Automatic annotation (TrEMBL), chain A:
Subcellular localization: Host cytoplasm, Host perinuclear region; Host membrane
Protein name: ORF1a
Annotated positions binding Zn(2+) 2: 64, 67, 73, 80
Disulfide bridge partners, by residue number: 107-118
Entry similarity comment: Belongs to the coronaviruses polyprotein 1ab family.
Source organism of this protein record: Human betacoronavirus 2c (isolate EMC/2012)
Biological role: Plays a role in the initial induction of autophagosomes from host endoplasmic reticulum. Later, limits the expansion of these phagosomes that are no longer able to deliver viral components to lysosomes. The replicase polyprotein of coronaviruses is a multifunctional protein: it contains the activities necessary for the transcription of negative stranded RNA, leader RNA, subgenomic mRNAs and progeny virion RNA as well as proteinases responsible for the cleavage of the polyprotein into functional products.
Binding site for Zn(2+) 3: 107, 110, 118, 120
Domain ExoN/MTase coactivator: 1-120
TrEMBL record, chain B:
Sites where the protein binds S-adenosyl-L-methionine: 41, 79, 97, 112-113, 130
Main function: Plays a pivotal role in viral transcription by stimulating both nsp14 3'-5' exoribonuclease and nsp16 2'-O-methyltransferase activities. Therefore plays an essential role in viral mRNAs cap methylation. Forms a hexadecamer with nsp7 (8 subunits of each) that may participate in viral replication by acting as a primase. Alternatively, may synthesize substantially longer products than oligonucleotide primers.
Subunit note: Interacts with nsp8 to form the replication-transcription complex (RTC): nsp12, nsp7, two subunits of nsp8, and up to two subunits of nsp13.
Gene name as annotated: orf1ab
Name the UniProt record assigns to this protein: ORF1ab polyprotein
Chain residues that bind S-adenosyl-L-homocysteine: 41, 79, 97, 112-113, 130
Domain Nidovirus-type SAM-dependent 2'-O-MTase: residue ranges: 2-291
Family that this chain belongs to: Belongs to the coronaviruses polyprotein 1ab family.
Signal peptide: none
Subcellular location: Host cytoplasm, Host perinuclear region; Host endoplasmic reticulum-Golgi intermediate compartment; Host membrane
Source organism of this protein record: Human betacoronavirus 2c (isolate EMC/2012)
């Protein structure tokens, strides 16, 4: 809960978290990792879990920095893109699900993670 | 080891019909923990959901689910996420807890469950509530009030006919009144997950609310039967049931919602309610707020 306190002392919470983890800070813990049949489509954000064999699925609110830190979401509409949904993370990035989400963007055309599934 | 592959154990009629004094609960594996791959409450809620997959749950469109005691000291709600994974995509989840948390629910309310005003009637109530003072065992293990008074009033007033409840109890966290209310459902049991088999925890299930007394239950004697069952039944910690999740999601039954006057409820309606084939409640817009 140290890093959670830290992102309240900044104007750019995304950069604050990323600079912290990139400098050796402990990633946020207690992200809610689901148990899933790894038979999903593999898209980034989904209404039901969609992990492939190379992914893990997390409860969306738990991997959202703005949800976890109880700070304003940057989305112009004010709606969180993860909350109430499921987020698929590459299995090699489960060490920091929140950092991965802050570091990547789903494909605006195919909604797969750009660089981790999106083939457009 | 068939039972290890089941999600847990359900109290059989063999022990429902006993007549015994209330005794201390003594589990051979008490406090033993099973490792997870993943919060323990992920396995616990999934196994509860798996058992409810075998019950005649009413599953309508826009299903109304309220989840009490959803928070943890970590500020997250693993059980609410499991419900999101389990329930239809168009189900409405409202969760609540004394302490602050964030969850994948549609509506999240902080504070005592007594502050949660349900304006309409809901289809499914999940409660994991447990009061810390219950651990201060001094003297006789008597029926508890606490949050059970709220829950009993909820069942009597804000639960659709055909709706169901799953309410966590333990050896010392239990209510005479809540047991007796199970007699107003088509069926009832206590379900103990295999993931938490080393605890006296169980989920008191009322399946398909009928609004009228079907079984006369002596709640004090029935809790004594529940403890007698736990004291008599080897339960091995296990999450084998979660090894195959291909059919985990709640069946999309499309259960109809009907508005009926109580005078119109006949044998056909009671039969449909008891089979999980009908709900009777409003179809307004659901409103659940803090008072
Ligand atoms: C069954 N049993 C009880 N005692 C004795 O009687 C007391 C009351 O039990 P009690 O009714 O809590 O039930 P148990 O401890 O299962 O509950 P267990 O702790 O599993 O309770 C489980 C639930 O506690 C709740 N809980 C744990 N974390 C929190 C929390 O952070 N906040 C709140 N409010 N509740 C929490 C949560 O619902 C969890 O699932 C026990 O504490 C022992 O002294 C037993 N002693 C022996 N030697 N052998 C036994 O088999 C035995
Ligand atoms: N009267 C009450 N109103 C609302 N929540 C209550 C309550 N009494 C106890 N609780 C809650 O009961 C919960 C028991 S632990 C809940 C664990 C949670 N289900 C999970 O998925 O991790 C605690 O969060 C406690 O705050
Ligand atoms: Zn968010
Ligand atoms: Zn693409």
């Amino acid at each position: 809960s140290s890093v959670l306190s830290l992102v309240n002392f900044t104007v750019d919470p995304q950069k604050a978290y990323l600079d912290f983890v990139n400098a050796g800070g402990a990633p946020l813990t207690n992200c809610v990792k689901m148990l899933t049949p790894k038979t999903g489509t593999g898209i980034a954000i989904s209404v039901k879990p969609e992990s492939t064999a190379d992914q893990e699925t997390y409860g969306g609110a738990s991997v959202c920095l703005y949800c976890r830190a109880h700070i304003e979401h940057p989305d112009v509409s004010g709606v969180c893109k993860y909350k109430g949904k499921f987020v698929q993370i590459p299995a090699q990035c489960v060490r920091d699900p929140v950092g991965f989400c802050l570091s990547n963007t789903p494909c605006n055309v195919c909604q797969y993670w750009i660089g981790y599934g999106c083939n457009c | 080891a068939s039972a290890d592959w089941k999600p847990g154990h359900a109290m059989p009629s063999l022990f429902k019909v006993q007549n015994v004094n209330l005794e201390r609960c003594e589990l051979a594996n008490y406090k033993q923990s099973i490792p997870m791959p993943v919060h323990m409450n992920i396995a616990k809620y999934m196994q509860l959901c798996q058992y409810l997959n075998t019950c005649t749950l009413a599953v309508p469109a826009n299903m109304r689910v309220i989840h009490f005691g959803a928070g943890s000291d970590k500020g997250i709600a693993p059980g609410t996420s499991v419900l999101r994974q389990w329930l239809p995509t168009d189900a409405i989840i409202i969760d609540n807890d004394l302490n602050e948390f964030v969850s994948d629910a549609d509506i999240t309310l902080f504070g005592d469950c007594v502050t949660v005003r349900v304006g309409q009637q809901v289809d499914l109530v999940i409660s994991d509530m447990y009061d810390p003072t219950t651990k201060n065992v001094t003297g006789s293990n008597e029926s508890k009030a606490l949050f059970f008074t709220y829950l009993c009033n909820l069942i009597n007033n804000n639960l659709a006919l055909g709706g169901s409840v799953a309410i966590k109890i333990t050896e010392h966290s239990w209510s005479v009144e809540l047991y007796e209310l199970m007699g107003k459902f088509a069926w009832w049991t206590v379900f103990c997950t295999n993931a938490n088999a080393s605890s006296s925890e169980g989920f008191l299930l009322g399946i398909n609310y009928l609004g009228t007394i079907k079984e006369n239950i002596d709640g004090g004697a029935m809790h004594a039967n529940y403890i007698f069952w736990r004291n008599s039944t080897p339960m091995n910690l296990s999450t084998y049931s979660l090894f195959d999740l291909s059919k985990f999601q709640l069946k999309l039954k499309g259960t109809p919602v009907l508005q009926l006057k109580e005078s119109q409820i006949n044998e056909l309606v009671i039969s449909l309610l008891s089979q999980g084939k009908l709900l009777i409640r409003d179809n307004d817009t659901l409103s659940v707020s803090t008072d």
